[PDB]
Every structure is written in C-alpha cells, then in structure tokens.
C-alpha cells in the first residue's frame, strides 16, 4: 500500500475540486505556507510502509521560513517555536539526547509521520485555512493508517488530537496521549510524560526497531 493509492481513494470518495480551486487562488494571490512543493513533505519522507509512529499537529507555522510540511518542525534560520522547544526539553529528559537540528526530517526518515491536521495557512494568520477540506483529508489519512497498518504508535497531544481516537483501532495500535507541549499546557502533564521512550517500548514489544529520536 502506498500513499498514491490512498490519496487517489480519498479524492475519489470526496469532492475536493472547490478546495483545489481555492488553494490555487490562494497560492497565486497570497502568501501561503509551507512552500507548495512541501505541502506533503511528511508523506514524501515517511512512505506508508515505513510508518511506525504518527504525531498529529495543528496547522502549519505561519511565519517566514518556518513551515516545511512536517508537524512541529521548522527550517534552520527561522524563529524557533515554543512547543518544539518543550518537545526537545522532554526528549532530553526522557531519552537523554539534546537535539540541535531545528527540523524533524530525521524523525520522518525513522518512520514518524508528522501529520498536521490542516496542511496550509496564510502568512501571519493562524487557522486561516481551517474548514476548507483539509480536516476531511487528514481524517481519511488517519483512518487509512489505522486500517491498513498494524502496530503503529499514535501520539495524541492535546484534546483536539485526542478526538481522533475515534478513527484509530486500539486493538491493533498503541495510543499515547497527554496534554500539548505548548507552554500553556506543558507543565500539567507533558513534561515527564516520556512519549518517546513509551513509543519505543511499544515498538520493541511488537518486534519493531525503535525510533532513533536523536541526532543522526
């Protein structure tokens, strides 16, 4: 099973023509992030067969040079997000490594699908592309991962991400949940939650190799 087949099935099931037309207009008319060639970078770097972990995000970062198609990741020489800083602090406390690389392409290559639920945003306007169709698309992605894979870890940070438990078959997959790494919630259960080692313990228990969350 490959993403091309899944994407085709989704675009067959639902009519995305109005969404495609809107995004065409938006990219030619406004400043939309990430760069268009990166909208599906999570999928490009983590082929369907390689998925071991899914981490859900929100919409992309909306500042220059930040977003590049992976949830929570920023490019080098971009403003560094507080949630990512807290993810890295917990990683250092959990696994032990201090990451210096600001982007998460390492994690994607290891099999971590870094899936925003909304895949575009206008510059400087958080949530500007909410409710245009992306949530239908990314729900169907989540469901396809749950349906066609076995023994994947779904890491669901924050209540909105946790609503997606309805799309996940908990008899075949692991769910790790906690509050979100944002400063507004991190001190009430994200720090000390050890999601990275919990994910690896699960993967090892089902005969899979762990994620290398550290610098490569």
How far is CA 166 from each of CA 27, 58, 173, 179, 208, rounded to the nearest angstrom? 33, 17, 13, 18, 25
Which string of DSSP letters, residue by residue, matches 65-115? TT-SSSTT---TTSPPPHHHHHHHHHHHHHT------SS-HHHHHHTEEEE
CA distances from 3 to 6, 10, 72 (A): 5, 10, 21
User: In angstroms, rounded to a whole number, what is the distance separating the alpha carbons of residues 123 and 112?
Assistant: 26
Residue 84's nearest CA partner among 70, 95, 96, 134 is 70
Sequence-distant (6+) residues with CB within 8 A of 84 are 72, 73, 74, 102, 181
CA distance 170 to 152: 10
Burial class (CB in 10 A: 0-12, 13-18, 19+), 167: middle
Interatomic CA distance for residues 191 and 112, integer angstroms: 20
Resolution of the deposited coordinates, in angstroms? 1.5
CB contact at 8 A, 31 and 89:
no
Helix (H, G, I), strand (E, B) or coil at 164: helix
Peptide bond into 143 cis (omega under 30): no
Q: What is the CATH number of the domain that holds 24?
A: 3.40.470.10
Evaluate whether 46 touches 108 at the Cβ level (below 8 Å).
Answer: yes
Q: What angle do CA 151, 118, 161 make, to 5 degrees?
A: 50
Structural domain total, the chain: 1
Measured at the CA of 125, the angle between CA 157 and CA 82, to 5 degrees, comes to 40
Find where tokens 């090892």 sit. 204
In sequence order, which residues have a C-beta less than 8 Å from that of residue 172 and are 6 or more positions away?
146, 149, 150, 151
Domain of residue 77: give its range: 1-216
Active-site residue set: 59
Q: Tell me the torsion sign for CA atoms 31, 37, 40, 42.
A: negative
Closest CA to 122 of 32, 20, 16: 32
Interior angle at CA 151, CA 205 and CA 182, nearest 5: 95
């Amino acid at each position: 099973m490959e993403w091309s087949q899944i994407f085709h099935d989704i675009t067959t099931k639902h009519d995305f023509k109005a969404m495609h037309d809107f995004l065409e207009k938006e990219y030619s008319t406004a400043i939309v992030y990430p760069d268009r060639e990166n909208i599906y970078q999570a999928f490009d770097l983590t082929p369907f067969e390689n998925i071991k972990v899914v981490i859900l995000g929100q919409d992309p970062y909306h500042g220059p040079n930040q977003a590049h198609g992976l949830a929570f990741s920023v490019q080098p020489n971009a403003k560094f997000p507080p949630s990512l800083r807290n993810m890295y602090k917990e990683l250092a406390d959990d696994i032990g490594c201090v990451r210096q690389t600001p982007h998460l392409q390492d994690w994607a290559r290891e099999g971590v699908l870094l899936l925003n639920t909304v895949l575009t945003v206008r510059q400087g306007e958080a949530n500007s592309h909410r409710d245009i169709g992306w949530e239908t698309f990314t729900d169907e992605i989540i469901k396809a991962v749950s349906d066609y894979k076995e023994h994947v870890v779904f890491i669901l940070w924050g209540k909105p991400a946790q609503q997606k438990i309805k799309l996940i078959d908990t008899s075949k997959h692991c769910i790790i949940k906690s509050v979100h790494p944002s400063p507004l919630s991190a001190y009430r259960g994200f720090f000390g939650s050890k999601p990275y080692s919990k994910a690896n313990t699960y993967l090892e228990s089902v005969g899979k190799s762990p994620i290398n969350w550290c610098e490569s």
